Write a protein that holds these residues in place. Structure first.
Motif, mmCIF file in Angstrom:
data_model
loop_
_atom_site.group_PDB
_atom_site.id
_atom_site.type_symbol
_atom_site.label_atom_id
_atom_site.label_comp_id
_atom_site.label_asym_id
_atom_site.label_seq_id
_atom_site.Cartn_x
_atom_site.Cartn_y
_atom_site.Cartn_z
ATOM 1 N N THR A 1 7.236 119.587 -3.779
ATOM 2 C CA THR A 1 8.515 119.001 -4.162
ATOM 3 C C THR A 1 8.761 117.648 -3.503
ATOM 4 O O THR A 1 9.143 116.691 -4.177
ATOM 5 N N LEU B 1 9.006 113.877 -5.296
ATOM 6 C CA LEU B 1 10.189 113.030 -5.137
ATOM 7 C C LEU B 1 9.842 111.710 -4.459
ATOM 8 O O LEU B 1 10.477 110.685 -4.710
ATOM 9 N N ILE C 1 28.804 116.150 -9.353
ATOM 10 C CA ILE C 1 28.453 115.887 -10.739
ATOM 11 C C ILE C 1 29.644 116.148 -11.648
ATOM 12 O O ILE C 1 30.003 115.303 -12.465
ATOM 13 N N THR D 1 21.528 105.668 -22.033
ATOM 14 C CA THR D 1 20.479 105.186 -21.137
ATOM 15 C C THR D 1 20.182 103.777 -21.643
ATOM 16 O O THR D 1 20.233 103.523 -22.845
ATOM 17 N N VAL E 1 10.835 112.016 -16.011
ATOM 18 C CA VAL E 1 12.058 111.746 -16.752
ATOM 19 C C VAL E 1 12.019 110.296 -17.244
ATOM 20 O O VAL E 1 11.175 109.512 -16.805
ATOM 21 N N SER E 2 12.925 109.938 -18.151
ATOM 22 C CA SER E 2 12.922 108.597 -18.734
ATOM 23 C C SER E 2 12.808 107.399 -17.794
ATOM 24 O O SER E 2 12.081 106.458 -18.106
ATOM 25 N N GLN F 1 22.435 120.359 -12.106
ATOM 26 C CA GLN F 1 21.578 119.191 -11.942
ATOM 27 C C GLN F 1 21.909 118.470 -10.635
ATOM 28 O O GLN F 1 22.685 118.983 -9.832
ATOM 29 N N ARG F 2 21.325 117.295 -10.418
ATOM 30 C CA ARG F 2 21.549 116.542 -9.185
ATOM 31 C C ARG F 2 22.039 115.111 -9.421
ATOM 32 O O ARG F 2 21.550 114.422 -10.320
ATOM 33 N N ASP G 1 18.169 111.863 -7.037
ATOM 34 C CA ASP G 1 16.989 112.675 -6.741
ATOM 35 C C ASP G 1 17.167 113.555 -5.494
ATOM 36 O O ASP G 1 17.383 113.053 -4.388
ATOM 37 N N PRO H 1 15.933 117.819 -3.950
ATOM 38 C CA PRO H 1 15.125 119.012 -4.220
ATOM 39 C C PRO H 1 15.791 119.970 -5.203
ATOM 40 O O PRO H 1 17.015 120.135 -5.206
ATOM 41 N N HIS H 2 14.973 120.595 -6.042
ATOM 42 C CA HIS H 2 15.455 121.541 -7.037
ATOM 43 C C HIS H 2 14.244 122.356 -7.488
ATOM 44 O O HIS H 2 13.132 121.834 -7.533
ATOM 45 N N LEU I 1 11.650 120.584 -11.093
ATOM 46 C CA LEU I 1 11.427 119.188 -10.731
ATOM 47 C C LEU I 1 12.045 118.170 -11.699
ATOM 48 O O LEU I 1 12.222 117.009 -11.344
ATOM 49 N N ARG I 2 12.379 118.597 -12.915
ATOM 50 C CA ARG I 2 13.017 117.685 -13.870
ATOM 51 C C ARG I 2 14.492 117.588 -13.474
ATOM 52 O O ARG I 2 15.044 116.501 -13.371
ATOM 53 N N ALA J 1 15.794 117.926 -10.741
ATOM 54 C CA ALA J 1 15.970 117.340 -9.418
ATOM 55 C C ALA J 1 16.285 115.842 -9.522
ATOM 56 O O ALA J 1 16.732 115.229 -8.557
ATOM 57 N N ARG J 2 16.075 115.262 -10.699
ATOM 58 C CA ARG J 2 16.284 113.825 -10.879
ATOM 59 C C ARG J 2 17.696 113.369 -11.268
ATOM 60 O O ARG J 2 18.412 114.064 -11.990
ATOM 61 N N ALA J 3 18.086 112.192 -10.769
ATOM 62 C CA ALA J 3 19.402 111.603 -11.038
ATOM 63 C C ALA J 3 19.866 111.910 -12.463
ATOM 64 O O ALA J 3 19.405 111.296 -13.424
ATOM 65 N N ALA J 4 20.797 112.854 -12.570
ATOM 66 C CA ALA J 4 21.333 113.324 -13.848
ATOM 67 C C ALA J 4 21.936 112.284 -14.792
ATOM 68 O O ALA J 4 21.769 112.391 -16.008
ATOM 69 N N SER K 1 18.858 109.408 -16.524
ATOM 70 C CA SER K 1 17.762 109.630 -17.458
ATOM 71 C C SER K 1 17.946 110.686 -18.529
ATOM 72 O O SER K 1 18.912 111.454 -18.528
ATOM 73 N N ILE K 2 16.981 110.691 -19.442
ATOM 74 C CA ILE K 2 16.883 111.687 -20.494
ATOM 75 C C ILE K 2 15.968 112.639 -19.727
ATOM 76 O O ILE K 2 14.871 112.247 -19.322
ATOM 77 N N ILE K 3 16.411 113.870 -19.511
ATOM 78 C CA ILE K 3 15.618 114.818 -18.731
ATOM 79 C C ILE K 3 15.180 116.086 -19.466
ATOM 80 O O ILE K 3 15.985 116.993 -19.711
ATOM 81 N N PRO K 4 13.888 116.170 -19.817
ATOM 82 C CA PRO K 4 13.401 117.360 -20.516
ATOM 83 C C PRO K 4 13.468 118.536 -19.549
ATOM 84 O O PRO K 4 13.190 118.378 -18.361
#
Ligand SMILES: NC(=O)c1ccc[n+]([C@@H]2O[C@H](COP(=O)([O-])OP(=O)(O)OC[C@H]3O[C@@H](n4cnc5c(N)ncnc54)[C@H](O)[C@@H]3O)[C@@H](O)[C@H]2O)c1
Ligand SMILES: NC(=O)c1ccc[n+]([C@@H]2O[C@H](COP(=O)([O-])OP(=O)(O)OC[C@H]3O[C@@H](n4cnc5c(N)ncnc54)[C@H](O)[C@@H]3O)[C@@H](O)[C@H]2O)c1
Ligand SMILES: NC(=O)c1ccc[n+]([C@@H]2O[C@H](COP(=O)([O-])OP(=O)(O)OC[C@H]3O[C@@H](n4cnc5c(N)ncnc54)[C@H](O)[C@@H]3O)[C@@H](O)[C@H]2O)c1
Ligand SMILES: NC(=O)c1ccc[n+]([C@@H]2O[C@H](COP(=O)([O-])OP(=O)(O)OC[C@H]3O[C@@H](n4cnc5c(N)ncnc54)[C@H](O)[C@@H]3O)[C@@H](O)[C@H]2O)c1
Ligand SMILES: O=C[C@H](O)COP(=O)(O)O
Ligand SMILES: O=C[C@H](O)COP(=O)(O)O
Ligand SMILES: O=C[C@H](O)COP(=O)(O)O
Ligand SMILES: O=C[C@H](O)COP(=O)(O)O
Lengths: 334, 334, 334, 334
Positions: free
Chosen positions: A39, A43, A186, C235, C280-281, D184-185, D188, D190-191, D194-195, D197-200, D203-206
């Motif tokens: 992890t 990151l 959030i 975005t 991610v994007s 979400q977060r 960035d 930990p989560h 791992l998707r 975990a990224r700045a919500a 980005s477009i987060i799959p």
């Protein structure tokens, strides 16, 4: 050269690591957080704000491997159990946000470390330092728990020093339009600060900050002369300080800007920068200085009241100051 | 009552229409823009900021149909051909942002209109008015082209009036953390203001503002005493004024708040509001007042320097003022 | 080597310029837009999405100066007044978005240019090309107005080609979650497309697109087999293609991913990339390829229906393809 | 009528409370979280997404007061110490997100509650229900721990039911462009995912979702025929399901839409809605139905493959279904 350990591999912890990679005198041999190496490695390599890390990152067991060097990964939520001494870690960067009080930060020393750099305003610390303003007050014999202050104070202090020394500050108030941080929420969640409990990317959120008052810690003559607040806004990184002050000496916009530019190219070079371009926050992402004067915004009324606006990448600039401070402390002998 | 026409059915034009729907003394009979009735009807019904319009909206030929009433839709790029006279329009709300110069706005009068309210700071206007501060200066015999100022000036003027009357303002500076508007750009496009050319939802964008100096137009005693700037941030609506002023009289936080609250209940009710709640910008979306004091943000240094923060919905508050001014002017005879 | 001109120095125009700086066979000698050189130079130097240009940028009269080289700046709204011939410009990149119809794009030919590359889907073009899929169909003698298709089609076509050749596509549907573009609106403004008229940074905005259909232009065997839509989200850059298709052969996630990885490392190297990282994007900002498979998202249901997800920096990737197409076209003789 | 308790007064917890206020047969007597009554009251009054609550909200001791009625406030981390029995709570809405496993949710029963509605997909639940699709399967004597599924499944199931019954679904895939949530977060961090975990908001987060497979729990015939994923985007609320399916019958767009509208006006009124308006996500904020077809997006390719798009306010729609479910369950006897 000096063995460094980072506690709390978050926004500051990781960006401090990125900065350390550019300083031969500092060697990060271990990091601690609450997750696994996979992890932290992910990151560290991919950053939503600062892009892909320019280095080889992988995992060996549950340790990190960066450019051929293995970094020990720990996962102890109690700093007292870190055993820094066993791995020869002399300096610990405390960046979890949870151990700013001396009683907690000192646990690293109890665990075998020699110096602790709290990456934020602290309580009962030996001394608060802002590089370019008072590192000369550091005493290797009496100082073991050091605070590097907040990023906002690192932005303000450098130019407040110039203004006071050249014109004399009677009093002033600041506001920092600051990007949201991981301390926010959030979507409307419980929080000690009822403002910070609100959706961070949806509003302009007024909040507190002791940055203005904290300046007196590195510039005692300004004690009781500054006050301020913050406004967290929907940007992921980069902030700006807005100071309005009453000066002792009569001045013009040109004199104020000249004094600031002089310091930027002189004594505070690398710490304070000066810009005459009409830029926006994104343009400062990745900036390593602690404060960049937006010269086009400087204004004065009756030659006594002035407004100074200064940009700061709250992550990169500050992280660079953490590494600079570690090298400085190391150079004074451990 | 009085027949109103709206030129430029945009953010302010449509929100003025919403405000007018709640005022019986005002009757909008025609609107002008650069598109068709279908498009304006759709935009009037569904608002990304203020939600679904609480009324029946449909189209009939080149007319909008709201709650049964029919509003004529015009599409003349040149206001000289609006023929306001033919349809009995007495007051024209000029909100295209292209005709702030008196010579241009006057084209409405030439087209048969009685008065013209420029929904923004103007040039060579017969007079600038801020409801609740200087509408008593409006003169029906000589004032034909009136400016209602900027939303920012409407937020500042009201409480600056109170601070000056009760404590006297020596000098002060302000910054408005303002939501982005349609004058900005989506992704780095040409703009006379190189700051406003940059991606609006991605940065904190400093930009000039004449709001602080425009206060002198409605409060002559403050001429040359104020100045300020703006910082456009990633929020769609709602802004906030941050004023730091030096006072003539010595004060405490309690005294400042007490005086602001008193004015909100008295002289400036409906114009100036007072809040002791720790709210954020989203909470003010839909607010009808021009200025709402964030009492918890009030602070003082040496009893002479004070900071006052005030919220304002730059769309809803300002639009209501525009209608209030329309009713006011009408009450003085056309 | 080949002299190139750019009409419309916007997001695509400027990023095409950045890619051109990296290709020795392409020399951009002039650009056209609707503003002055100072503004274009400033926009070229500071980018809110891709950061500061790593080159020296200045202005000299009506020319931009990049790394000592002079680049003529025009401001002619009518393409026919550009006089490309007079300055030896052979290939013109048409990126204003206003001249996608051949009759309009051909105005560059009337003005002396030899080839015109429309940076978008066109009408009545001599041929539409997607590098990596059908550049071999370009005919120097019969093709003068060429479309480089949309960024979306450049993303889809490459992997649709692999899926069809390896497994056979019966029919499929796609959706591209796309970053907003300058064709949208900051706050509800008139627009031919009532969806795009709405505040771009506040909603998920469905909108039509012929990108899936356009695949048939570069892969005729897929004629009538694909269709899709787009969804604009808040975005600033980077988009992703989501294709669901019915295959002629039974397959598994592993077989699909393996065939895709094989092509990305082989025949489509540089055009199609393959990733097994959970990104991610923001991570794809700056990516130069046309399409990157998000292998972790590949799914298959009931053996014959597959879902393939692929990323694309709609600005950088496309811009690189434009330059690639310009070099290819030139190599064929002008 | 029926006494209800809410465990986890968050986004769903508070919005369920709002829905409850409008249903005379449902009475929320107590709520539990991890903070104090004052914090929960502030959050209940001011909502960054749905505006201010239209009701009187205050605090009295350790309890909330809404429109005169008092609501008990608990702060027990362990649901087993809630003592639901002692206060007559028969149905508990489990919306903390931490007790989705039956063994955990069952603790509410041990605490004296009679029924537990898990506001999310669950593990080992007695039964999963989607109002309008299979509530008839609820057995009062054998079902004590019930799941109300996810908001996404509540959106998909209703129209998947229509498409299957009318045309027969062979297989299909879906993607839900979903607003970010509290799972979400901010930046960035930990989560486990791992998707996520990224700045919500950057980005477009799959990310994964079991919504498509979960439909089999409410519509057994679709077992093994559906699958899908999610794409989290920078919007605070409102999401949209995008389904592509192979049908057994050959159909037309008009045929599909007509069938969907018929179900919306009859069989699924109040659950499934039908819209022919070109709207965007903001327009659906506050929508109480579970699914609204975007009729303009319906598409059919090669007669057998269809794409159906449906909007859903993941907070309001789902919260209303939770309340509808509590009422239904109550009507079957406690
Ligand atoms: N982000 C900025 O702009 C900024 C700038 C200067 C200073 N700071 C300060 O630096 C500190 C960290 O801030 P941040 O933004 O990096 O926060 P963050 O939330 O991004 O990072 C904190 C990290 O510490 C970890 N952690 C939490 N408890 C832990 C524990 N008990 N033991 C080990 N690891 C633990 C978390 O998992 C996380 O990775 C704070 O004191 C903050 O005020 C922040
Ligand atoms: N938005 C705010 O916060 C705010 C607040 C107070 C005052 N204002 C002022 O109000 C004015 C309009 O601002 P806005 O934000 O509503 O802008 P906007 O762009 O949303 O609206 C302008 C409208 O005018 C139309 N238009 C342009 N030229 C036209 C012409 N020649 N004839 C007829 N119609 C034409 C446009 O199509 C558009 O619908 C400006 O002067 C602005 O500074 C804005
Ligand atoms: N943005 C993307 O992701 C993307 C991707 C692939 C293709 N495209 C396509 O490229 C084209 C341009 O898109 P963009 O996003 O760069 O738009 P943009 O709005 O950023 O750029 C258009 C530029 O052309 C200028 N312009 C307009 N009319 C002009 C005229 N008559 N003469 C000269 N200059 C004029 C504008 O001032 C602007 O600088 C469109 O056809 C679009 O569909 C965009
Ligand atoms: N948000 C949506 O769009 C959505 C829609 C449908 C279902 N759900 C589901 O509903 C549940 C809650 O989601 P949310 O978005 O409301 O989350 P949230 O984070 O907004 O709310 C969770 C609440 O639970 C509280 N909490 C945590 N642990 C607790 C404990 N042990 N005891 C008592 N209180 C505790 C938190 O303080 C918080 O107020 C999840 O299972 C989620 O998957 C979410
Ligand atoms: O720059 C300001 C402070 O460093 C912010 O700290 P925070 O992590 O508490 O938001
Ligand atoms: O509120 C401030 C001004 O009214 C903004 O005007 P603008 O339309 O130029 O952004
Ligand atoms: O990549 C998608 C298209 O190229 C977008 O074109 P646009 O300029 O119309 O947004
Ligand atoms: O609507 C979709 C799901 O209900 C989201 O659940 P989450 O809380 O895990 O984001």
């Amino acid at each position: 050269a000096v063995k460094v350990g980072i506690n709390g591999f978050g926004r500051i912890g990781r960006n401090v690591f990125r900065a350390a990679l550019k300083n031969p005198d500092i060697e990060v041999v271990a990091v601690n957080d609450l997750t696994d190496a996979n992890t932290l490695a992910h990151l560290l390599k991919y950053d939503s704000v600062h892009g892909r890390l320019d280095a080889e990152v992988s995992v060996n067991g549950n340790n990190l491997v960066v450019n051929g060097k293995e970094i020990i990964v720990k996962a102890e939520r109690d700093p007292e159990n870190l055993a820094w001494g066993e791995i020869g870690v002399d300096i610990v960067v405390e960046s979890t946000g949870r151990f700013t009080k001396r009683e907690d930060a000192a646990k690293h020393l109890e665990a075998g470390a020699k110096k602790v750099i709290i990456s934020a305003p602290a309580k009962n610390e030996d001394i608060t330092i802002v590089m370019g303003v008072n590192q000369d007050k550091y005493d290797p014999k009496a100082h073991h728990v050091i605070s590097n202050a907040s990023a906002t104070t690192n932005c303000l202090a450098p130019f407040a020093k110039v203004l006071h020394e050249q014109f004399g500050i009677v009093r002033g108030m600041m506001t920092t339009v600051h990007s949201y941080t991981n301390d926010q929420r959030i979507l409307d969640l419980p929080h000690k600060d009822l403002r910070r409990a609100r959706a961070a990317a949806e509003s302009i959120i007024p909040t507190t900050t002791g940055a203005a008052k904290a300046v007196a810690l590195v510039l005692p003559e300004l004690k009781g002369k500054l006050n301020g607040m913050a406004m967290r806004v929907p940007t992921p990184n980069v902030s700006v300080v807005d100071l309005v002050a009453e000066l002792e000496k009569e001045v013009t916009v040109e004199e104020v800007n000249a004094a600031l530019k002089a310091a930027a190219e002189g004594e505070l070079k690398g710490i304070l920068a000066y810009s005459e371009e009409p830029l926006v926050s994104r343009d400062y992402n990745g900036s390593t200085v602690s404060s960049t004067i937006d010269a086009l915004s400087t204004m004065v009324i009756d030659g006594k009241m002035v407004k100074v606006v200064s940009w700061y990448d709250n992550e990169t600039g500050y992280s660079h100051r953490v590494v600079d401070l570690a090298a400085y402390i190391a150079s004074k002998g451990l």
